Design a protein around this ligand. Structure first.
Ligand SMILES: *[C@@H]1O[C@H](CO)[C@@H](O[C@@H]2O[C@H](CO)[C@@H](O)[C@H](O)[C@H]2NC(C)=O)[C@H](O)[C@H]1NC(C)=O
Ligand code: RIP
Length: 246
């Protein structure tokens, strides 16, 4: 399992958490020195448990599928909650089975359905360590509309930061003051599967993407990533989605 406490959190302890989260994900190979997540894991071992504690010390446990870093559901006190999607229903066969009751959220876990549920795109929802403390708190008691925005904060501040060093840094910059994600952050999130695929296709193709990936950079400008020598590949991405899952 991995854990993160908001009480006394700072950029250093958040970075220790994101490092523990990356290191908990199994891999057998690296591709261009980036860990390649597994095609598949059977049974309970598919799910990592992330114990998150709000500033008051209240806790939820979040289940994350280790092949794709997708959050499947969470336990808060004696109730489990899962997204309304078959991968999550599958996860509910393995994790939090000792919950006294199980609620299926009224949406799946993808960004488009979550933003519809929340009533706002994630361009407009501040993220940071304080937003994550709020998100944990929100999830402690069921409210499906509030939970969709809490989950948009939770996914970005845990999974997306694990995938991209730039997003980990953005959150560290927001340790004591939330701010909406930069356009670059949103771009990276939206590009993780595409980048993961092109980095794998570049093995076999002399380091060159079969298809260029368009990203927004730190200055707000749209740029084309065409091969492994790009800073996004050498310095930023930390985990690749296996092409078997794309
Ligand atoms: C591989 O990617 C690099 C970019 O990371 C390409 O070089 C850049 O692209 C043009 C010049 O052709 C300029 O806009 C950039 O400033 C270049 N940057 C650097 C650091 O060289 C390069 O052309 C690509 N190579 C292949 C074979 O696609
Ligand atoms: O399917 C994707 C994954 O859950 C991502 O990590 C967050 O949002 C969804 O669109």
């Amino acid at each position: 399992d991995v854990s993160f406490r908001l009480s006394g959190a700072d950029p250093s302890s958040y970075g220790m958490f994101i490092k523990d989260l990356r290191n908990a994900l199994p891999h057998t190979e690296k591709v261009y020195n980036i860990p390649l997540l597994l095609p598949s894991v059977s049974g309970a071992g598919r799910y990592l448990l992330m114990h998150l504690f709000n500033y008051d010390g209240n806790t939820i446990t979040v289940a994350v599928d280790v092949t794709n870093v997708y959050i499947m559901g969470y336990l808060a006190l004696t109730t489990s909650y899962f997204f309304n999607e078959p991968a999550a229903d599958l996860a509910s066969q393995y994790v939090f089975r000792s919950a006294r009751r199980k609620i299926t959220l009224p949406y799946s876990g993808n960004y488009e359905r979550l933003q519809i549920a929340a009533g706002k795109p994630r361009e407009k929802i501040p993220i940071g360590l304080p937003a994550l403390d709020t998100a944990i708190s929100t999830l402690l008691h069921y409210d499906s509309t509030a939970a969709a925005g809490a989950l948009l904060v939770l996914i970005q501040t845990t999974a997306e930061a694990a995938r991209f060093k730039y997003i980990e840094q953005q959150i560290q910059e927001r340790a004591y003051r939330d701010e909406v994600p930069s356009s670059a952050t949103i771009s990276l999130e939206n590009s993780w599967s595409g980048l993961s695929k092109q980095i794998q296709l570049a093995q076999g193709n002399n380091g060159v993407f079969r298809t260029p990936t368009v990203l927004v950079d730190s200055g707000g400008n749209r740029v084309q990533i065409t091969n492994v020598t790009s800073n996004v590949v050498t310095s930023n991405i930390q985990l690749l989605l296996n092409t078997k899952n794309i």
